[PDB]
Symmetry: C3
Subunit: 296 residues, 3 copies
């Protein structure tokens, strides 16, 4: 099996079957863009360890490290004039996000009739800086966060399914997953500087799926085209002594079109560049990533 | 031969020569965001008859399911209802040779069978219902061209939609008023260009772009002169990535992604079509 | 080397090393969308002298036609130049088994287009600009290498804008304010992959991103102040082809999808490089 084919399957399935222990370093850049303008430059360094057992089971742990920069622009401004200034920027120095781990089980091996199929579960912990309690600090009509979050503040569990099959030369693949967020509590759920309100949060659950095609171009390179869509239900807050109330407009549909490659730098090292184009306003405008899975 | 080649030509030309009588079941999902979020599904039912690889006759019945959500949130929906029924005649006037392209000329007649937008009232403010068609007759002559330059298959198409003037009992969306009036929906010009590839015996892949340009629409209330609706013009651009997959010798699966490039296009459109050859 | 391969390299590198002289005619349409819709056409005229597949000298004259509609009133610019520019390029690495084709270049752009500063709001602009009003110098790097059948390529450049002055920096019809302007510098890069499909055709997929720093103004008798929201990130996804019409004439269609709000929705272009 050519390296390109192996690397392709790893990328499409999330199941790294060539080896035994592997470590992937990833760098990702993502770009986002009372009436005010927010521009965000977000970098994520991903550190992922994987153990593949007999091409059947896989265990992984991922530690994301988040660097962020948001710029807030008002047109308040200076003072009361609907089209004047105003620029405030806020940043987060490199900090851990939400640590997570996954178990995957390959329940179908590809044959003439069957796909490679992998079932998986992913458990994510709330280790990142949560968004709840972050205060908006007041130019007169421009309020800006005192800090930026690096995670969503809750535990979550994500069972998933991946399928891959070669119809030479096209490799078709698809995937689907469901994220259940666990309810949790916080000392402060208010972003009012003047107040402190304890409360609980239920983050809306989400459904994710993707399909795509990939090609092995030569011994060392593959290319991939895919689409994906994430659908998130609205989120709810319960202040102490209050009831559950939904946050209007917290629901989301984040669609992406992805073009990527796999490049075998050696037997052990792959370079995986990818572009994800945001198709909806809930997605970043675009996302560039470069991943370096290394096999040992 | 190969199936992939046939299926791709069908896709690129709109002329299905597989091929005598065929029935195509299509499912389409389209996503819009204005605050209004729209999830729109269309089940397409299309019958086609290809006569001697020269003439093609078809009827299409679209069935529309819609959910719009309005955020202060209130939601409005349309249960599965028929849209604008239409039929088409196509004539292949050039057959592909070393020098010639496959070229098809066509006309499509669309009837106002869907629930029209004109009576629909804004109720304290969301619509009481969602339309399923545009409320007018339209006629669309079109042109398609396809040619293989091995292994690239280049294609392009162009069409013009003339909308017929029509009259309605109510043109107003004010709940308190009823105003009869006439409507001229702005005509539109559509074109696209692309490239496709046969990957193997059974599969093709396609990349294309298209753009629709619609002129302004006009209203005449009873008594009453013609007024342009100054913001009714549109430019809807799309980038398409698609496949054809020969499931058997009778069934093709056609997945397509259309990415909206402009604000008048849905954010994205996913479709899955299943042409079946009897 | 097949014509497709040559045309491919020319497109990816900007270095047209298969002839002494070339002239490229390009037509570009771009679409942008109180509401404003803009239809913008640019006719590009570019002459190149390639010396021994080692050096290249070029001049580009863009001719700009523009139409903006404000919602309804419309404003237009009849065909007018163009920030004229020229470039010098040097191929410092020739592709071998180990090395890429690599070209270093410098591009000098002059402020010949109608500048935006001083254009009055009358509410709609009285006119539309065709250039940015300043000199700029852009050193750049291009790299291309075949890993059969994939041709990988990439490019990167930095634009330094020269400070300049204008008689009027205000768009207020009632005022005239002289001032100096430092246009924010920019960093540009792209990467992509291309394929020779046959003797005569190639296809390309690429991405690019332009990052522009904020600009600053000094009105006369005032101090330097940064122009909020003048910073920009214009990202593009490109799908393109090269088609050999003759051994001299290539047709180059390209679609550039804007990925950010600082980019046009989309850009369709058609370029016709001609080797003499
Ligand atoms: C970039 C979007 C391109 C679409 C990706 C294709 C995968 C999604 O398709 C869903 C249905 O496909 C099932 C394929 O079934 C195989 C049939 O072939 C059997 C005969 O050889
Ligand atoms: C407008 C319908 C015309 C179709 C009639 C075609 C007759 C062809 O005869 C086949 C030999
Ligand atoms: C199902 C649509 C029918 C189209 C109009 C009539 C076509 C008649 O063709 C007859 C051909 O027979 C020739 C022998
Ligand atoms: C996303 C795609 C971007 C670039 C696609 C450009 C496609 C250029 O194709 C033009 C289409 O024209 C179709 C006609 O083909 C037949 C040519 O007829 C000439 C006879 O030799
Ligand atoms: C067919 C047109 C050739 C035009 C050559 C343009 C020369 C560019 O000028 C700058 C180079 O100066 C150093 C020589
Ligand atoms: C952030 C680095 C994570 C390293 C985690 C490695 C997962 C495999 C653990 C051993 C399984 C027995
Ligand atoms: C750029 C981030 C995209 C997020 C949307 C997710 C799309 C596909 C979801 C299924 C993933 C399942 N998998 C491969 C983990 O098993
Ligand atoms: C993983 C490859 C990353 C590609 C490089 C993208 C650079 C984006 C830089 C944005 C931040 C710079 N700036 C000027 C806004 O400060
Ligand atoms: C995806 C929505 C497309 C809307 C605009 C389409 C422009 C195509 C013009 C003529 C169509 C002929 N064709 C390709 C169907 O054979
Ligand atoms: C040549 C055959 C053309 C297709 C004919 C299909 C009839 C449509 C019946 C579907 C009914 C839909 N609905 C939901 C309103 O009940
Ligand atoms: C309104 C018409 C709807 C479509 C007509 C479908 C007819 C079903 C025929 C089933 C038998 C087909 N076959 C090839 C398996 O024999
Ligand atoms: C046409 C839009 C401009 C966007 C800026 C980014 C362009 C990156 C590609 C530069 C190509 C340079 N060169 C010398 C290789 O041709
Ligand atoms: Na959107
Ligand atoms: Na737009
Ligand atoms: Na944007």
């Amino acid at each position: 099996p050519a390296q390109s084919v192996s690397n392709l399957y790893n990328e499409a399935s999330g199941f790294f079957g060539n080896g035994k222990f592997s470590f992937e370093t990833g760098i990702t850049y993502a770009r986002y863009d009372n009436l005010d303008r927010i521009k965000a430059d977000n970098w994520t360094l991903d550190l992922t360890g994987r153990y593949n057992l007999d091409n059947r089971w896989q265990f992984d742990v991922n530690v994301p490290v988040v660097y962020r920069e948001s710029t807030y622009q008002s047109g308040g401004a200076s003072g009361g004039d609907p089209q004047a200034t105003s620029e405030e920027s806020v940043s987060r120095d490199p900090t851990i996000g939400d640590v997570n781990f996954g178990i995957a089980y390959k329940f179908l091996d590809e044959s003439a009739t069957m796909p490679d199929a992998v079932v998986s579960v992913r458990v994510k912990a709330p280790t990142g800086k949560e968004p709840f309690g972050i205060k908006l600090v007041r130019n007169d009509n421009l309020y800006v966060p005192e800090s930026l979050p690096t995670g969503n503040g809750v535990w979550s569990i994500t069972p998933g399914l991946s399928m891959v099959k070669t119809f030479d030369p096209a490799v078709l693949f698809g995937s689907v997953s469901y994220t259940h967020n666990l309810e949790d509590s916080f000392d402060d759920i208010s972003s009012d500087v003047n107040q402190k309100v304890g409360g609980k949060v239920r983050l809306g659950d989400s459904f994710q799926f993707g399909v795509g095609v990939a090609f092995a171009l030569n011994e060392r390179m593959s290319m991939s085209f895919s689409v994906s869509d994430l659908i998130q239900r609205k989120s709810k807050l319960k202040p102490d002594g209050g009831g559950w109330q939904s946050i209007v407009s917290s629901d989301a549909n984040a669609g992406y079109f992805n073009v990527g490659m796999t490049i075998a730098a050696s037997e052990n090292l792959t370079i995986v560049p990818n572009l994800a184009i945001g198709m909806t306003d809930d997605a970043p405008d675009f996302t560039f990533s470069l991943k370096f899975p290394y096999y040992f």
